[PDB]
A paper describes a structure:
Two secondary sites for apramycin were observed on the SSU, overlapping previously reported sites, as well as one new site on the LSU. While the densities for the core-scaffold of each antibiotic were very well resolved and could be modeled unambiguously, flexibility was evident for parts of some molecules: for example, the C9-moieties of omadacycline, eravacycline and the pentacycline, ring III of apramycin, the β-lysine of capreomycin and the C14-moieties of tiamulin and retapamulin. In addition to the first layer of water molecules that directly mediate antibiotic–ribosome interactions, we also observed the appearance of density for a second layer of water molecules that do not directly contact the drug, but rather interact with the stabilized water molecules in the first layer. This is most clearly seen for tetracycline and kasugamycin, where multiple waters generate an extensive second layer, but also for apramycin, hygromycin B, streptomycin, tiamulin and lincomycin, where stabilization of individual second-layer water molecules is observed.
Numbering used by the authors:
A (entry chain F): 1 to 103
B (entry chain K): 13 to 129
C (entry chain O): 2 to 89
D (entry chain R): 11 to 74
E (entry chain U): 13 to 59
The structure:
Amino acid sequence: MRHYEIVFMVHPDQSEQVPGMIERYTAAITGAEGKIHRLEDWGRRQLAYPINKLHKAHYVLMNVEAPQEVIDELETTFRFNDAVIRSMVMRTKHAVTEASPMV
Amino acid sequence: RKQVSDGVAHIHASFNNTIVTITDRQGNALGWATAGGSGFRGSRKSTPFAAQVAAERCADAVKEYGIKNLEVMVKGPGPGRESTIRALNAAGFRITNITDVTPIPHXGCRPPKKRRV
Amino acid sequence: SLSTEATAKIVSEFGRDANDTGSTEVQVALLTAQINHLQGHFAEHKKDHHSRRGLLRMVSQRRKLLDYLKRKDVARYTQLIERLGLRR
Amino acid sequence: CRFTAEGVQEIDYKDIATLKNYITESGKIVPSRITGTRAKYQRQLARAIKRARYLSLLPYTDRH
Amino acid sequence: DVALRRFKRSCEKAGVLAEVRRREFYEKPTTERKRAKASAVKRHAKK
RNA sequence: GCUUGAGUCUCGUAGAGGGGGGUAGAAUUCCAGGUGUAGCGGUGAAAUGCGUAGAGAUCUGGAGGAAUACCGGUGGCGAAGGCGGCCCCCUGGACGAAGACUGACGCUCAGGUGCGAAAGCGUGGGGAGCAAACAGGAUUAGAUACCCUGGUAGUCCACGCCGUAAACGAUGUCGACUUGGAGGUUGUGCCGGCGUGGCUUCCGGAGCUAACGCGUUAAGUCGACCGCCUGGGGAGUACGGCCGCAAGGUUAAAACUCAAAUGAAUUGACGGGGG
Ligand SMILES: CN[C@@H]1[C@@H](O[C@H]2O[C@H](CO)[C@@H](N)[C@H](O)[C@H]2O)O[C@H]2C[C@@H](N)[C@@H](O[C@H]3[C@H](O)[C@@H](O)[C@H](N)C[C@@H]3N)O[C@@H]2[C@@H]1O
Ligand SMILES: [K+]
Ligand SMILES: [K+]
Ligand SMILES: [K+]
Ligand SMILES: [K+]
Ligand SMILES: [K+]
Ligand SMILES: [K+]
Ligand SMILES: [K+]
Ligand SMILES: [Mg+2]
Ligand SMILES: [Mg+2]
Ligand SMILES: [Mg+2]
Ligand SMILES: [Mg+2]
Ligand SMILES: [Mg+2]
Ligand SMILES: [Mg+2]
Ligand SMILES: [Mg+2]
Ligand SMILES: [Mg+2]
Ligand SMILES: [Mg+2]
Ligand SMILES: [Mg+2]
Ligand SMILES: [Mg+2]
Ligand SMILES: [Mg+2]
Ligand SMILES: [Mg+2]
Ligand SMILES: [Mg+2]
Ligand SMILES: [Mg+2]
Ligand SMILES: [Mg+2]
């Protein structure tokens, strides 16, 4: 199991689906013996530039420990979920539990 | 014919020529002038003076619309960068903001080969 | 590279101890483990020439260690190449 | 170098207020020779800014 | 004229016209490396 | 036998090292539409070209390819060739600390084998930009050029081939030893200093060198092994062999001919070099 930092940006219209998305994704992680070391719903932020004409998006940050397989699966989920406008999965060396600079 | 008040002067300052196009803020053109169409060919076309005259003739082209405010968008390396803006201020437009909009690739396409003059 | 756990398993199987990491048998077993592991990599990544240079060093090092072991102790050599399923 | 002076481990792409000090008005990454950042931290900073730009936490350019 | 002098200075700061002049023609990587080395040796001779 | 060479293990560090996949933003081009109207473009000057069938400019939307500004650095990594957005996956090497382990397991290497820029070649894709060829416009005594407007191969991808470059540090690899000074980069010990490693620059001492220069990253002082040279031209050519789809590569002469060819530095003179 490896440590990953996941940021996903949701379409501001589907801001109300984000609690549902989080509980779905975190269940997919913990289902396969993973751990959510950090979750932060940053909410709707102004984008620094437009993405698909959107000037805002709803950011979620997740630091996760998980098998590679379920993270690959969560990446496919992001790709095909139309609500998720952008995502970034990054490997981290260790688990990050502390508050982000956003909170 | 219709009134606008606040438009945008687009200065296309190339090495060879200066095109001045005054648009509204939706980017719909109202009028335009060029150094090359202002009585300047060859060496003289690519000068700040010829660009000034182009700026003046463009102001004449948009006087019907009754523009008072211009945002100035400057595009390119040419001699008519500064002289065009001075001439627009001198025509009695209020210059509200000057942006450089010169396109820069973040790498982009391979440019033409160097000239062996 | 070989994981900490896979390394330690090979050291246990082939050494005289957990400390016996230097033994020719351990070294050859470790090189053999990674040579065998990397066959899957190079099956997929046929044009990874840079990594393959590291593989060919492992192969050459193993050959030199086996040739050392053969001339020092033929019976240890015979046992080792049997356990690891090497031709020579 | 602020980052050495604070014993910073890795620069965070998320720490936008920090990163804003090392970009110009245009959005361009400021050279280490201007800012006095150490080479090791300049490289982390460049990566962090590029990650922040991808997530649209920083602008690539002043004229998007 | 203050705001125009301010625009001028902002363009010099951003290095727009240096960037345009650089990108007018293709420089071979050999030529780029040769001038980078020339700039390094000159900057060293400054010291 | 031994542990000092050479390896293994443990923890960690930096990195455009490699392979695969994904993705982002800027820009160019094109397509469609809006505004708009006589120019645009180009040059030393022009013209070809483009434009009233509405260009250029400007705005909106779309398509597509290629490359990744800034960071960026006598910065880094790699055996060399080379490698630069970001993210993931697979993967190679280097280095440091402290300790354990093996016990000369080493160095070099003809033949052999592998890798090997760009161009080129084959098959299948792709094609924005650039651009051999080519076309037109100039320039010119001419101008099969330089300049301009276009533009095909190609440049891109997959797989296979080619096997060469001023593939250069024009400097083979390995080891040891021999005053200094100033930097960069990357570890690390101890208390901002003081050390101690790796890599990498500049200057310079002895010494060496024809000189230029090199100078602990030696071209110094030595040792091991390999490669290569033997006047210029003819010629890296011919012929033969081998290799290659080809282009060609590789190995490699002779006749004949000349009394030089050459290196470095010196004084002039000269320059459409500078001051
Ligand atoms: C300190 N090492 C340098 C070497 O570096 C090369 O080999 C090293 C390995 O040993 C590498 N680490 C390095 O990356 C690589 O570049 O290149 C040579 C090239 C040679 N013409 C001469 O240059 C001189 C010039 O010839 C002269 O004209 C100039 N004025 C001064 C130069 N030093 O001396 C240098 C010098 O010996
Ligand atoms: K999506
Ligand atoms: K041998
Ligand atoms: K073409
Ligand atoms: K001399
Ligand atoms: K040797
Ligand atoms: K040799
Ligand atoms: K002769
Ligand atoms: Mg041109
Ligand atoms: Mg790696
Ligand atoms: Mg190196
Ligand atoms: Mg050979
Ligand atoms: Mg090629
Ligand atoms: Mg082809
Ligand atoms: Mg062309
Ligand atoms: Mg041409
Ligand atoms: Mg050769
Ligand atoms: Mg080279
Ligand atoms: Mg070189
Ligand atoms: Mg050579
Ligand atoms: Mg020296
Ligand atoms: Mg010599
Ligand atoms: Mg031949
Ligand atoms: Mg032959």
